[PDB]
Amino acid sequence: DSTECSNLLLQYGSFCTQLNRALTGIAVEQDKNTQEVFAQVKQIYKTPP
Amino acid sequence: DSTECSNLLLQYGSFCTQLNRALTGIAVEQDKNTQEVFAQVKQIYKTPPIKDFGGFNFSQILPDPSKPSKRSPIEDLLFNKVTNGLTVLPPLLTDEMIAQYTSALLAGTITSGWTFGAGP
Amino acid sequence: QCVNLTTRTQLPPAYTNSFTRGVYYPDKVFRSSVLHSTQDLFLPFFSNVTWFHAIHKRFDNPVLPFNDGVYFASTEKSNIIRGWIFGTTLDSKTQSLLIVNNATNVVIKVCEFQFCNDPFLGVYYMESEFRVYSSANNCTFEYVSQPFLNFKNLREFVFKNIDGYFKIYSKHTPINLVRDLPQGFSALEPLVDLPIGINITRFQTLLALHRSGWTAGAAAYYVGYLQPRTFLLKYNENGTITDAVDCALDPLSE
Amino acid sequence: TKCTLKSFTVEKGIYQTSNFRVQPTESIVRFPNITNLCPFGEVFNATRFASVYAWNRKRISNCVADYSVLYNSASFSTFKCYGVSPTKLNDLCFTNVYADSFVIRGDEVRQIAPGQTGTIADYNYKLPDDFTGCVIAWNSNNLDSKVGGNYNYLYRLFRKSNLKPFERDISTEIYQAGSTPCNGVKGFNCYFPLQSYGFQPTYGVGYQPYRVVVLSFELLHAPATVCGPKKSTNLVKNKCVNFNFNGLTGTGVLTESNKKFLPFQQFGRDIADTTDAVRDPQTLEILDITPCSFGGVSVITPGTNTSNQVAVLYQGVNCTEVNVFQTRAGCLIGAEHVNNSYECDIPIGAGICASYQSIIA
Amino acid sequence: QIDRLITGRLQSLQTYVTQQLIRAAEIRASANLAATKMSECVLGQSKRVD
Amino acid sequence: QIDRLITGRLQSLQTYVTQQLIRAAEIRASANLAATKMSECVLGQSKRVD
Numbered sequence A: 001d002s003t004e005c006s007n008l009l010l011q012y013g014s015f016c017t018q019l020n021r022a023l024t025g026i027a028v029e030q031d032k033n034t035q036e037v038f039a040q041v042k043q044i045y046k047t048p049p
Numbered sequence B: 001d002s003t004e005c006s007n008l009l010l011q012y013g014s015f016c017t018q019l020n021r022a023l024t025g026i027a028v029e030q031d032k033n034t035q036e037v038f039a040q041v042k043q044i045y046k047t048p049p050i051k052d053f054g055g056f057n058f059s060q061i062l063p064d065p066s067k068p069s070k071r072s073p074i075e076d077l078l079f080n081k082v083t084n085g086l087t088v089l090p091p092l093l094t095d096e097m098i099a100q101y102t103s104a105l106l107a108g109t110i111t112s113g114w115t116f117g118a119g120p
Numbered sequence C: 001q002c003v004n005l006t007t008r009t010q011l012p013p014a015y016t017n018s019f020t021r022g023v024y025y026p027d028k029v030f031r032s033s034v035l036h037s038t039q040d041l042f043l044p045f046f047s048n049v050t051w052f053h054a055i056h057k058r059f060d061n062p063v064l065p066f067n068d069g070v071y072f073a074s075t076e077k078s079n080i081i082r083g084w085i086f087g088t089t090l091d092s093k094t095q096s097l098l099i100v101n102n103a104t105n106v107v108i109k110v111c112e113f114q115f116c117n118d119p120f121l122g123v124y125y126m127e128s129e130f131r132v133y134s135s136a137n138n139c140t141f142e143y144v145s146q147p148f149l150n151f152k153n154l155r156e157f158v159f160k161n162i163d164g165y166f167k168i169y170s171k172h173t174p175i176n177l178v179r180d181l182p183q184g185f186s187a188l189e190p191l192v193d194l195p196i197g198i199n200i201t202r203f204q205t206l207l208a209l210h211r212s213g214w215t216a217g218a219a220a221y222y223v224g225y226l227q228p229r230t231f232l233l234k235y236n237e238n239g240t241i242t243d244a245v246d247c248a249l250d251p252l253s254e
Numbered sequence D: 001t002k003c004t005l006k007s008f009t010v011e012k013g014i015y016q017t018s019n020f021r022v023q024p025t026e027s028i029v030r031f032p033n034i035t036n037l038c039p040f041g042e043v044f045n046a047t048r049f050a051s052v053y054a055w056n057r058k059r060i061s062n063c064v065a066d067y068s069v070l071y072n073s074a075s076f077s078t079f080k081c082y083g084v085s086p087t088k089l090n091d092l093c094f095t096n097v098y099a100d101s102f103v104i105r106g107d108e109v110r111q112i113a114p115g116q117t118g119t120i121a122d123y124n125y126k127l128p129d130d131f132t133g134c135v136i137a138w139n140s141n142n143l144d145s146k147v148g149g150n151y152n153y154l155y156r157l158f159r160k161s162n163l164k165p166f167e168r169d170i171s172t173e174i175y176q177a178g179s180t181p182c183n184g185v186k187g188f189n190c191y192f193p194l195q196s197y198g199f200q201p202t203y204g205v206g207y208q209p210y211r212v213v214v215l216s217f218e219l220l221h222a223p224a225t226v227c228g229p230k231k232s233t234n235l236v237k238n239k240c241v242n243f244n245f246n247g248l249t250g251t252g253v254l255t256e257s258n259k260k261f262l263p264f265q266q267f268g269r270d271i272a273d274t275t276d277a278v279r280d281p282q283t284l285e286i287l288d289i290t291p292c293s294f295g296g297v298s299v300i301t302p303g304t305n306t307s308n309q310v311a312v313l314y315q316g317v318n319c320t321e322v323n324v325f326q327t328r329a330g331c332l333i334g335a336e337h338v339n340n341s342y343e344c345d346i347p348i349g350a351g352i353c354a355s356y357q358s359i360i361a
Numbered sequence E, F: 001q002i003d004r005l006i007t008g009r010l011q012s013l014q015t016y017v018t019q020q021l022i023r024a025a026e027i028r029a030s031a032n033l034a035a036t037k038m039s040e041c042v043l044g045q046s047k048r049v050d
Ligand SMILES: *[C@@H]1O[C@H](CO)[C@@H](O[C@@H]2O[C@H](CO)[C@@H](O)[C@H](O)[C@H]2NC(C)=O)[C@H](O)[C@H]1NC(C)=O
Pocket: B051, B057, B058, B059, B060
């Protein structure tokens, strides 16, 4: 929460935006991976009783 | 163009050489990728001038002779739908030659089946 | 010479909406077909701006705190608003900045003035009444320039005191709306930067009387305050700012 | 290529070895018009100068000052600076200048100095020990002196205490030489402090009247309005030059521009915040700044076991700006372009390949 | 002092993000393999040995 | 001051080259997949499901 630290960190540019963008890409890539693996059917089939 | 900056940059050694070599490896890897994908045939096949394929129509995927780019209508639509020391190296295969490779693959798979992928 | 105006009618000040006004060019840089995000003292969108009237009997010339900057909007006909009063204590103890537009030219002076409690000009129905100061002792800067100037004219001004530089941004807009601020977009061009180097914490508008007692001509003006925030500015093909986004207004513009 | 690969044998292929640069040829500095000059003509060459007890103080501010004309004048018999350099007055910037003009005797010209003790220094005009600026003095025997004696120039002779720096004293209080009470009434030991000089044309050098102008500089937190003159050179277009426009410097090719600036705008930026357009301050015209044609130098060779013939590829460089052939990859020098088509041996790019059979492309 | 702490923590965070990108690439390759196994072993009978 | 600018720009360039290498690995994997689909779907008929 140090505002002097963030004022000094703004001198380094868009490194933080790059890291947040990479982590966001990884985070949506995990959901894409689960979607690709498990959601291969659009019909929810049920066994007979 | 600052010579004092380059004199101070020489103190850090061969970082620039490593960055240039990594980018050169990426640049030749892209051409290798295109070579592995599209250049799977060493014979440039053509369709016959008469398109009698028993009712099957391939005009949307065969190259259009009226277009100067020699692209298919589908390929033309695909190409329309895609829009300080920095240099951009051109790709080794131009878009015309990639279209020629796809035309050869289409002519082979239309006129010859899967036989052209396993031999003559 | 000073005169107390004792025929005023008591009324609380009004408030209205800023809409998307108060935008100015942050720098002297041309930009073509690009979106530029900048961090500067900007006026917030849809903000609460203070509304003052001059109508007959209303004559609103108070002293207000300057804060970090002043957006001055003027719905003006027949040229009632003539200048502004800039300083800290508004007396001869400190040094004050004077902006006046009389019948001939605009005069910019940085001196030790003795301001009246009720400063005004006057037009006799011909301008023959100047009662804005009583003295001028120690001047450090004088600058004579070209004149800046139903409500027919709209005058926007931005005043900033940054590192001893006085930035005046302005825009002239032809409007035909009767009462309130019109809703629209107009980026203020930089007009003149003044080397004043003085402390300013309070300000006061200068009006003009109409004599035929006294009569107040029909005028209305608006005061907004500049806050440090981020704008996303849109530059068209011709390089003028046609639209802006306030990054701290709502989550959509964020 | 052997230097780059750190080997004495080079395998067949293309090797990026160096980086072609279009070297900057000229330096173009364009600075705006030198107007609103400081009124030094009404201070140094005024009609009547002031006395030294009531020295005239002129405030020089909000103007550009040409000290080279003042320094190159040969009429001045004394030009001594104590905080700055005379040759760097046209380069430095100051907030304001105080010009103190007076007339003194020729033997008292040295008394306007830091650390100097004299009657003029103690009672008429005092400089601080950390004084910055320049003292200028010249002889004025042809103007100030009168054959009947010029008694208009007074000077203070007596005061109880020494002056503070930059302090005036126009008071005419009767001095007490002794301890007798004087109520403003002159007596045996009470004299008027201001005496008149004896400027006459028959006196030699040392008693002639000298006009002195003292310039003092202030370096407060106010903006530096007083600056030296700017010597703008001519503008050269269509060449890779080093441009310096109003403090914005760089290297580029300056061509004519079709971008119509608004009158308040001076520079132009693209999406990537690089200066590609600018306005000349001398003549209000818009110039595009194209970056010089930098490129990569690649060497195309077969094996050194095979041959020592090489070809050079300048990437993204036109062939008129460097067996010369123009490709979309760049300019290829040393390879003979042929109309036949073969398999790719050494890749150049954009469908161009090189092979050895001489080197053909 | 904050400049030293900022460059140290930024180097640590960049190292962490680079390792996470490499591990995410590995997990993406494993998930593409798993989707291929889901298509070819569960939704059909595969002639591919092992 | 130039040393500070040099280390900042060098860190930026190393970051760019690292993420370009990661994206190059991803594009190489996609291109190997595309070459596999070129060999097995275009040059022949594939029994592999989906
Ligand atoms: C194959 O398909 C093409 C395209 O669908 C057919 O070309 C169309 O022909 C009709 C009648 O001649 C025209 O009205 C359309 O404008 C044509 N479309 C295009 C895109 O050219 C073609 O007739 C089909 N058959 C053969 C044998 O080529």
